[PDB]
Design a protein around this motif. Structure first.
Motif, PDB file in Angstrom:
ATOM      1  N   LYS A  59      27.142  12.981  39.197  1.00 33.41           N
ATOM      2  CA  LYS A  59      28.283  12.188  39.905  1.00 33.41           C
ATOM      3  C   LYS A  59      27.856  11.378  41.057  1.00 33.41           C
ATOM      4  CE  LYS A  59      31.832  15.663  38.786  1.00 33.41           C
ATOM      5  NZ  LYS A  59      33.046  16.598  39.254  1.00 33.41           N
ATOM      6  N   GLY A  60      26.555  11.379  41.232  1.00 34.79           N
ATOM      7  CA  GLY A  60      25.962  10.566  42.491  1.00 34.79           C
ATOM      8  C   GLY A  60      26.067  10.689  44.003  1.00 34.79           C
ATOM      9  N   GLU A  61      26.381  12.247  43.976  1.00 33.26           N
ATOM     10  CA  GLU A  61      26.548  12.882  45.116  1.00 33.26           C
ATOM     11  C   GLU A  61      25.309  13.282  45.877  1.00 33.26           C
ATOM     12  OE1 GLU A  61      29.308  15.828  43.943  1.00 33.26           O
ATOM     13  OE2 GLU A  61      30.930  15.290  45.368  1.00 33.26           O
ATOM     14  N   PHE A  62      25.010  12.818  47.090  1.00 36.52           N
ATOM     15  CA  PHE A  62      23.732  12.998  47.583  1.00 36.52           C
ATOM     16  C   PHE A  62      23.667  14.361  48.354  1.00 36.52           C
ATOM     17  CE2 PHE A  62      21.008  12.505  51.414  1.00 36.52           C
ATOM     18  CZ  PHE A  62      19.774  12.230  50.800  1.00 36.52           C
ATOM     19  N   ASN A  63      22.585  15.154  47.966  1.00 32.41           N
ATOM     20  CA  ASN A  63      22.553  16.486  48.394  1.00 32.41           C
ATOM     21  C   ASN A  63      21.349  16.584  49.566  1.00 32.41           C
ATOM     22  OD1 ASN A  63      21.948  19.267  48.787  1.00 32.41           O
ATOM     23  ND2 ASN A  63      21.943  19.703  46.515  1.00 32.41           N
ATOM     24  N   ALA A  64      21.803  16.581  50.721  1.00 31.72           N
ATOM     25  CA  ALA A  64      21.015  16.395  51.834  1.00 31.72           C
ATOM     26  C   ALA A  64      19.817  17.564  51.854  1.00 31.72           C
ATOM     27  CB  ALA A  64      21.757  16.223  53.173  1.00 31.72           C
ATOM     28  N   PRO A  65      20.583  18.778  52.099  1.00 26.04           N
ATOM     29  CA  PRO A  65      19.711  20.062  51.935  1.00 26.04           C
ATOM     30  C   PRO A  65      18.765  19.946  50.941  1.00 26.04           C
ATOM     31  CG  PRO A  65      21.752  20.681  52.841  1.00 26.04           C
ATOM     32  CD  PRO A  65      22.045  19.211  52.425  1.00 26.04           C
ATOM     33  N   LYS A  66      19.001  19.697  49.654  1.00 25.43           N
ATOM     34  CA  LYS A  66      18.216  19.593  48.671  1.00 25.43           C
ATOM     35  C   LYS A  66      17.026  18.383  48.623  1.00 25.43           C
ATOM     36  CE  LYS A  66      17.307  19.743  43.863  1.00 25.43           C
ATOM     37  NZ  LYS A  66      16.525  20.632  42.906  1.00 25.43           N
ATOM     38  N   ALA A  67      17.622  17.371  49.213  1.00 27.87           N
ATOM     39  CA  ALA A  67      16.746  16.170  49.246  1.00 27.87           C
ATOM     40  C   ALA A  67      15.461  16.545  50.454  1.00 27.87           C
ATOM     41  CB  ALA A  67      17.372  14.913  50.010  1.00 27.87           C
ATOM     42  N   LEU A  68      16.102  17.397  51.517  1.00 33.32           N
ATOM     43  CA  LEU A  68      14.929  17.459  52.784  1.00 33.32           C
ATOM     44  C   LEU A  68      14.155  18.641  52.286  1.00 33.32           C
ATOM     45  CD1 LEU A  68      17.177  17.914  55.599  1.00 33.32           C
ATOM     46  CD2 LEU A  68      15.767  16.250  55.250  1.00 33.32           C
ATOM     47  N   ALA A  69      14.476  19.553  51.170  1.00 31.63           N
ATOM     48  CA  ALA A  69      13.667  20.518  50.458  1.00 31.63           C
ATOM     49  C   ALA A  69      12.671  19.837  49.727  1.00 31.63           C
ATOM     50  CB  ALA A  69      14.352  21.720  50.004  1.00 31.63           C
ATOM     51  N   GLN A  70      13.045  18.497  48.917  1.00 32.83           N
ATOM     52  CA  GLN A  70      12.217  18.214  48.063  1.00 32.83           C
ATOM     53  C   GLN A  70      11.266  16.948  48.549  1.00 32.83           C
ATOM     54  OE1 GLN A  70      11.957  18.610  44.840  1.00 32.83           O
ATOM     55  NE2 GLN A  70      12.996  20.418  45.514  1.00 32.83           N
ATOM     56  N   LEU A  71      11.697  16.707  50.009  1.00 29.47           N
ATOM     57  CA  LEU A  71      10.671  15.514  50.514  1.00 29.47           C
ATOM     58  C   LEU A  71       9.057  15.623  50.025  1.00 29.47           C
ATOM     59  CD1 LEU A  71      12.274  14.500  53.721  1.00 29.47           C
ATOM     60  CD2 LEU A  71      12.252  13.273  51.547  1.00 29.47           C
ATOM     61  N   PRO A  72       8.451  16.857  50.455  1.00 30.76           N
ATOM     62  CA  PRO A  72       7.046  17.059  50.012  1.00 30.76           C
ATOM     63  C   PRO A  72       6.669  16.900  48.730  1.00 30.76           C
ATOM     64  CG  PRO A  72       7.937  19.079  51.265  1.00 30.76           C
ATOM     65  CD  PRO A  72       9.052  17.938  50.889  1.00 30.76           C
ATOM     66  N   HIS A  73       7.619  16.835  47.648  1.00 35.76           N
ATOM     67  CA  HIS A  73       7.160  16.493  46.458  1.00 35.76           C
ATOM     68  C   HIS A  73       7.760  14.966  45.946  1.00 35.76           C
ATOM     69  CE1 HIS A  73       6.539  20.737  45.437  1.00 35.76           C
ATOM     70  NE2 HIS A  73       7.620  20.952  46.323  1.00 35.76           N
TER      71      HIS A  73
ATOM     72  N   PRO B  25       2.914  13.087  53.807  1.00 36.59           N
ATOM     73  CA  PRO B  25       3.091  13.525  54.944  1.00 36.59           C
ATOM     74  C   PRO B  25       3.539  12.369  56.319  1.00 36.59           C
ATOM     75  CG  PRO B  25       1.275  14.721  54.192  1.00 36.59           C
ATOM     76  CD  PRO B  25       1.537  13.330  53.114  1.00 36.59           C
ATOM     77  N   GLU B  26       2.727  11.172  55.891  1.00 36.49           N
ATOM     78  CA  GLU B  26       2.817   9.924  56.555  1.00 36.49           C
ATOM     79  C   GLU B  26       4.323   9.290  56.667  1.00 36.49           C
ATOM     80  OE1 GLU B  26       0.360  10.460  54.599  1.00 36.49           O
ATOM     81  OE2 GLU B  26      -1.680  10.113  55.713  1.00 36.49           O
ATOM     82  N   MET B  27       5.022   9.540  55.652  1.00 36.50           N
ATOM     83  CA  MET B  27       6.414   9.165  55.372  1.00 36.50           C
ATOM     84  C   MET B  27       7.509   9.971  55.625  1.00 36.50           C
ATOM     85  SD  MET B  27       5.817   6.400  52.464  1.00 36.50           S
ATOM     86  CE  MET B  27       7.340   5.300  52.584  1.00 36.50           C
ATOM     87  N   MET B  28       7.057  11.321  56.065  1.00 36.67           N
ATOM     88  CA  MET B  28       8.206  12.342  56.174  1.00 36.67           C
ATOM     89  C   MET B  28       9.297  12.268  57.152  1.00 36.67           C
ATOM     90  SD  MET B  28       7.791  15.077  53.902  1.00 36.67           S
ATOM     91  CE  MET B  28       8.275  16.723  54.503  1.00 36.67           C
ATOM     92  N   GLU B  29       8.584  12.049  58.440  1.00 40.88           N
ATOM     93  CA  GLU B  29       9.491  11.784  59.550  1.00 40.88           C
ATOM     94  C   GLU B  29      10.521  10.637  59.361  1.00 40.88           C
ATOM     95  OE1 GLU B  29      10.916  13.872  61.700  1.00 40.88           O
ATOM     96  OE2 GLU B  29      11.618  12.697  63.117  1.00 40.88           O
ATOM     97  N   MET B  30       9.932   9.665  58.805  1.00 42.23           N
ATOM     98  CA  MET B  30      10.806   8.648  58.480  1.00 42.23           C
ATOM     99  C   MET B  30      12.005   8.875  57.485  1.00 42.23           C
ATOM    100  SD  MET B  30      10.109   4.706  56.834  1.00 42.23           S
ATOM    101  CE  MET B  30       9.826   5.535  55.271  1.00 42.23           C
ATOM    102  N   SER B  31      11.636   9.461  56.610  1.00 44.42           N
ATOM    103  CA  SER B  31      12.512  10.246  55.576  1.00 44.42           C
ATOM    104  C   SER B  31      13.449  11.047  55.858  1.00 44.42           C
ATOM    105  CB  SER B  31      11.743  10.588  54.261  1.00 44.42           C
ATOM    106  OG  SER B  31      10.801   9.613  53.755  1.00 44.42           O
ATOM    107  N   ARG B  32      13.077  11.832  56.693  1.00 43.63           N
ATOM    108  CA  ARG B  32      14.087  12.923  57.349  1.00 43.63           C
ATOM    109  C   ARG B  32      15.130  12.176  57.992  1.00 43.63           C
ATOM    110  NH1 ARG B  32       9.100  16.783  57.888  1.00 43.63           N
ATOM    111  NH2 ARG B  32       8.796  15.567  60.025  1.00 43.63           N
ATOM    112  N   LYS B  33      14.632  11.504  58.921  1.00 40.90           N
ATOM    113  CA  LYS B  33      15.580  10.685  59.766  1.00 40.90           C
ATOM    114  C   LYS B  33      16.596   9.621  58.922  1.00 40.90           C
ATOM    115  CE  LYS B  33      13.123  10.332  64.074  1.00 40.90           C
ATOM    116  NZ  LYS B  33      11.893  10.135  63.849  1.00 40.90           N
ATOM    117  N   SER B  34      16.329   9.055  57.772  1.00 41.23           N
ATOM    118  CA  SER B  34      17.266   8.348  56.734  1.00 41.23           C
ATOM    119  C   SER B  34      18.058   9.549  56.204  1.00 41.23           C
ATOM    120  CB  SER B  34      16.470   7.663  56.061  1.00 41.23           C
ATOM    121  OG  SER B  34      15.628   6.380  56.473  1.00 41.23           O
ATOM    122  N   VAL B  35      17.376  10.591  55.714  1.00 38.42           N
ATOM    123  CA  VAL B  35      18.576  11.588  54.887  1.00 38.42           C
ATOM    124  C   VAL B  35      19.507  11.833  55.830  1.00 38.42           C
ATOM    125  CG1 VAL B  35      18.350  14.015  54.380  1.00 38.42           C
ATOM    126  CG2 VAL B  35      16.691  12.732  53.502  1.00 38.42           C
ATOM    127  N   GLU B  36      19.250  12.148  57.145  1.00 40.84           N
ATOM    128  CA  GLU B  36      20.138  12.314  58.238  1.00 40.84           C
ATOM    129  C   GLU B  36      21.366  11.227  58.451  1.00 40.84           C
ATOM    130  OE1 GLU B  36      21.412  15.457  59.368  1.00 40.84           O
ATOM    131  OE2 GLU B  36      20.061  16.002  57.549  1.00 40.84           O
TER     132      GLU B  36
END
Length: 124
Positions: A61-75, A79-90
């Motif tokens: 349904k296109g609903e973004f899942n923030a907790p799941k996205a945060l958990a998926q980031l390492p995959h 590492p170089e883009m993790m903090e920028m990605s965490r910031k955009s997730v939020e």
């Protein structure tokens, strides 16, 4: 994932989604460098949904899942883009609530990531 692996993964992810749609190369090139500053076709929006479904960050349904996205980031990113990605997730976690249609929900969330990105943003 290393940066080299990440950069190559972009092409591999694209290959699993682009054939399902009718897309312009110029539009894919722009998204690839994080330039979402042009009107998208429905096919391009649905392409972004296909890519996000592969990533596991949205449901059908296109609903973004923030907790799941945060958990998926390492995959998903190096590492170089993790903090920028965490910031955009939020910053972009609630964008999907403004739209009802699934492809649009995902596209607008991806566009938000690109705009909130405090560094270079790259879309498959």
């Amino acid at each position: 994932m290393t940066m080299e692996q990440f950069l190559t993964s972009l092409d591999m992810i694209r290959s699993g989604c682009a054939p399902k749609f009718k897309l312009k190369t110029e539009d894919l090139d722009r998204l690839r460098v994080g330039d979402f500053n042009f009107p998208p076709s429905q096919d391009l929006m649905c392409y972004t949904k296909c890519v996000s479904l592969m990533a596991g960050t949205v449901n059908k349904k296109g609903e973004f899942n923030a907790p799941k996205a945060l958990a998926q980031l390492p995959h998903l990113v190096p590492p170089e883009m993790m903090e920028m990605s965490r910031k955009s997730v939020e910053a972009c976690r609630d964008t999907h609530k403004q739209f009802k249609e699934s492809c649009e929900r995902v596209y607008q969330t991806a566009k938000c990531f690109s705009e909130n990105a405090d560094g270079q943003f790259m879309w498959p």
